């Protein structure tokens, strides 16, 4: 019984780590949309202050 429960642990950790790896990759694809939107907005705002800063 002990040795079967140890093999059941390893198979349960395997499927848990699969789900964790997929949920991590799915969070990368959301943080990169937040980052790129903040990148573009920071360029637009700084260049508006520069162009509106002259004259």
């Amino acid at each position: 019984g002990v040795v079967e429960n140890l093999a059941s642990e390893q198979a349960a950790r395997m499927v848990a780590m699969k789900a964790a790896t997929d949920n991590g990759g799915s969070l990368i694809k959301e943080l990169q949309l937040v980052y790129n939107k903040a990148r573009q907005a920071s360029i637009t705002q700084e260049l508006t202050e520069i162009v509106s800063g002259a004259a």
Binding site: A16, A20, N23, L27, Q45, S52
Partner: protein, 458 residues
Amino acid sequence: TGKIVQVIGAVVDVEFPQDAVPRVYDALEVQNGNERLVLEVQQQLGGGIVRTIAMGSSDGLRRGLDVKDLEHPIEVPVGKATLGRIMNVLGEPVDMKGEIGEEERWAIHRAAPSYEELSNSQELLETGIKVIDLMAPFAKGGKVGLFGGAGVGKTVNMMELIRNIAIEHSGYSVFAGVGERTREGNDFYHEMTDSNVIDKVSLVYGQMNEPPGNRLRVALTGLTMAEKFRDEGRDVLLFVDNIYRYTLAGTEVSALLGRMPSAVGYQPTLAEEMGVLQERITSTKTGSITSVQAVYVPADDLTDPSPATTFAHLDATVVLSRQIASLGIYPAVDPLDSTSRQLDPLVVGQEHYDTARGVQSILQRYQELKDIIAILGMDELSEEDKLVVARARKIQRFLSQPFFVAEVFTGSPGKYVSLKDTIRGFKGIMEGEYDHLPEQAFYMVGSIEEAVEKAKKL
């Protein structure tokens, strides 16, 4: 006696003789073909030039038109004769009924009441809505603001507040339509007339199709009527359909007035324009205005300068969010940002205060768990962290409620929940006396009873 000398968009410049130049905010008048156009003076430039905003369509103006100087501000019909009728920004009647039989007219530009004249009240106003007068209760004679992005329930919530407050309010009511869909205004007018409550409501509309000068000044026309009913000594309700449009119509004009842009391209005078309106919509020792204001937030960005400066002017702030509306939970109120000046142990009593802080403490702790739940899922939580998550999800669903104005959408019958009944429900969930019902039992139920009954139906 004066001539048009430049025409930029909605802004018109007029030249007058040096002895005859208009005061600021005086109203001018022009023949625009077969139409009459009113211009409001904004600035005096050098040399008898005066710069003005057109209160109507700017198309079809030539240079060199004769302008007539009416030597007074924009003045609007006021008082008991203004009641049950629809008006322009200029106070003209816009329903097909006849003349407004007004005895008095007031200028729409006024000073706020003196600091000596203000008055304070702790009297709770009760509402049908579980989350609002649990988390952000508000008082007779105070200001309420509904914040949200596009399409999240700002209007539906204000229309429920109109229904529920008018149950216990006897006096007159004013509705300022600033920059919202006309179709809404027509639906509301027919709702008011088909229920015969129209006899007590005064409506001012300057809807989003109208050019910038209308949208800027129509907010002030609405206040000027409510200030009359207040100075008659009554107590009054003022509902404002979207106050953001006032500051945006100021942005659309500002650059044409020749002003350097500020911050995210806003007018430099933004904080003064907002204050000079908001400070006259107040209660006083002679009478009281209770007001609900919708506040659109652009691009869901709660940190934009226009939302950010509006937060300081309000007593109760309710913050809607798209992420909760997307989960089906209506009203999509965020309990972790909605707040009130009135949520004090002394004002509401300890049991209410303690229940509200308990709900916030649990829901915040559930937010702290979402990152580990996202990466690893729930099985790696602690054995009482699983209990917090189970109570927090039940609390989230029990904040949801059926509305009588949402039967056109849900089809479900609506519910009114008394204060005593909601705090008892939330206290009981937090003590765990309901910890054996499923989550779905709490969705869209008026009172806890209805949740145990719904759990019997699964």
